[PDB]
């Protein structure tokens, strides 16, 4: 007859989300308290990741209802606050600064700070950038909103690849479609131990240092024809950028308390030069054309570009970190032409008092880096927003980086967390031996 027969270890799963887990690469070369994403206690990963390719099944995906990008964004915020917790407060630095210009974008400010003695007062000088100072005869930009905790010079903001790993009893489903839309079924899925190398970068309008595409450029958004969500244009090829801060800055240690040391920008020597980035001209010219071909597939007419209309300074420019210093690069020179080595040079301005995530609370002060600064932007994606209610002849895609979950959705679109239910009931012709 047909009697139940329970099987333990059946390959059936349910859509359910759990708590992920960091597992960095076997690169414990620390030698100093560093790696604010790994911090102290992120475990080594598997040297041989057991990537297990599946066939025979089509499972649907939803990269905007994914809970991994909510959990990753909560961790990076939590790592940001935890690394700044033992760092030096800048409470006694919120005094009237006496700033005179250098010529420029640097203001020579002299302020009034208590020494380690609670009665003696000293007068010291420092170099502060223009958008770090608001008029009042000057103060810091956000001393009347919240406190400032400077970044500890020991730690590093270099994003190392971290693998978000589901615990025992769960699995991560990796979609392997070469041209994969995001929302919708995936014909070729593979369960993995956990994710690939994910660099937790911070960047607006330009997804830096990520995963590249294989076949062509995939244009990704929730609805495309909706103007309210940003469009993630995931690139196939990657352009080369050489960003720099080509002025020689000296780091000045200002005594502000017992153990609390305030590292300001000392005397600048050499040439007063602007920070710039070279995003080729030939690779970007071919990059925008291949972006136009994919954007013309979802439309029927010409499509033009135009720089960002407004907002705060950190979205109208191209923000990132370049060797412990935060840049703000004017990307008007990029999205200028209207489509259907002679390099373009982006003027970038440097800020030290940065208020990342716009959460009311800690807004760190990046200490200056001694000497020249050079890094390697790489671009594996773009962040574009559609324009409003308009004529059908042409449309504008303004660049824009909204909530930071769009940065993680460019790398967490492939993955999905499901729970494993190894108990399963299925009738067969077998029956156990009767008692009587």
């Amino acid at each position: 007859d047909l009697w139940v027969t329970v099987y333990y270890g059946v390959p059936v799963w349910k859509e359910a989300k759990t708590t992920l887990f960091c597992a960095s690469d076997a690169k414990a070369y620390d030698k100093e308290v560093r790696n604010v994403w790994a911090t102290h206690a992120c475990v080594p990963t598997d040297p041989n990741p057991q990537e297990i390719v599946l066939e025979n099944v089509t499972e649907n995906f939803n990269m905007w209802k994914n809970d991994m990008v909510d959990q990753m964004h909560e961790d990076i915020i939590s790592l940001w606050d935890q690394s700044l917790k033992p760092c030096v407060k800048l409470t006694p630095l919120c005094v009237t600064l006496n700033c005179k210009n250098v010529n420029g974008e640097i203001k020579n400010c002299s302020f009034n700070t208590t020494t380690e003695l609670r009665d003696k007062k000293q007068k010291v000088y420092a170099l502060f950038y223009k958008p770090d100072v608001v008029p009042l005869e000057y103060i810091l930009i956000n001393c009347n909103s919240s406190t400032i905790t400077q970044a500890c010079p020991k730690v590093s903001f270099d994003p190392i690849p971290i693998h978000y790993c589901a615990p025992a009893g769960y699995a991560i489903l990796k979609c392997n479609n070469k041209t994969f839309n995001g929302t919708g079924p995936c014909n070729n899925v593979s369960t993995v131990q956990c994710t690939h190398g994910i660099k937790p970068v911070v960047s607006t309008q330009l997804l830096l240092n990520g995963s590249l595409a294989e076949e062509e450029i995939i244009v990704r958004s929730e609805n495309l024809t909706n103007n309210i969500k940003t469009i993630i244009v995931h690139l196939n090829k990657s352009v080369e950028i050489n960003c720099t801060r080509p002025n020689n800055n000296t780091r000045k240690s200002v005594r502000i308390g017992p153990g609390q040391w305030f590292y300001a920008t000392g005397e600048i020597i050499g040439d007063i030069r602007e920070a710039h980035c070279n995003i080729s001209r030939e690779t970007w010219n071919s990059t925008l054309i291949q972006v136009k071909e994919k954007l013309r597939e979802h439309y029927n007419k010409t499509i033009k570009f135009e720089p960002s209309s407004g907002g705060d300074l950190e979205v109208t420019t191209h923000s990132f970190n370049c060797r412990g210093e935060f840049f703000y690069c004017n990307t008007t020179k990029l999205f200028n032409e209207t489509k259907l080595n002679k390099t373009i040079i982006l003027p970038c301005r440097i800020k030290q008092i940065i208020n990342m995530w716009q959460e009311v609370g800690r807004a760190m002060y990046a200490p200056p880096i001694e000497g020249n600064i050079t890094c390697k932007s790489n671009i594996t994606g773009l962040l574009l927003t559609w324009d409003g209610g308009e004529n059908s002849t042409e449309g504008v895609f303004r660049p824009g980086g909204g909530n930071m979950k769009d940065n993680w959705r460019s790398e967490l679109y492939k993955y999905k967390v499901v729970e494993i239910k190894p108990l399963g009931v299925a009738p067969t012709k077998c029956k156990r031996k009767v008692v009587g």
């Binding site: 007859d1 047909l2 009697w3 139940v4 027969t5 329970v6 099987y7 333990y8 270890g9 059946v10 390959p11 059936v12 799963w13 759990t18 708590t19 992920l20 887990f21 960091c22 597992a23 911090t39 102290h40 206690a41 992120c42 475990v43 080594p44 598997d46 057991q50 297990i52 599946l54 066939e55 025979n56 099944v57 961790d75 939590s78 790592l79 935890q82 615990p167 025992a168 009893g169 699995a171 369960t191 494993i420 239910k421 190894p422 108990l423 399963g424 009931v425 299925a426 009738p427 067969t428 012709k429 077998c430 029956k431 156990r432 009767v434 008692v435 009587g436």
Partner: protein, 134 residues
Amino acid sequence: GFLGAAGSTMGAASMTLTVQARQLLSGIVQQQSNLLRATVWGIKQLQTRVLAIERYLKDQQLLGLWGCSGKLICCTAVPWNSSWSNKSLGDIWDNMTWMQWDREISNYTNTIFRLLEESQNQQEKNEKDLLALD
């Protein structure tokens, strides 16, 4: 490998059920705490380890109350009420996958799970106690 036979037929998948059984808990090859460093990651890690044991111990508990603790495949003597599924033997084990099976009978699985604990193992043990009395 783990979940490798998720798209295969039930007959092919039923041969490699040990693989999914192993990886549900371990766990301890990848880490033990780890006590090589001595944070957000520490609290996050620990809550996952408790959950992995707690979910695992539920299944062995359910298998235990069905008298199937030691085995991965056990047969029972509760009959299959046809209202649950009307499909035959050849329409289930050689043409359908486990994923589509769970979707259709999930409404009454709890009542089926009630039949596995009451109908057999609660009756078999009382009868087996009455059988070994002599």
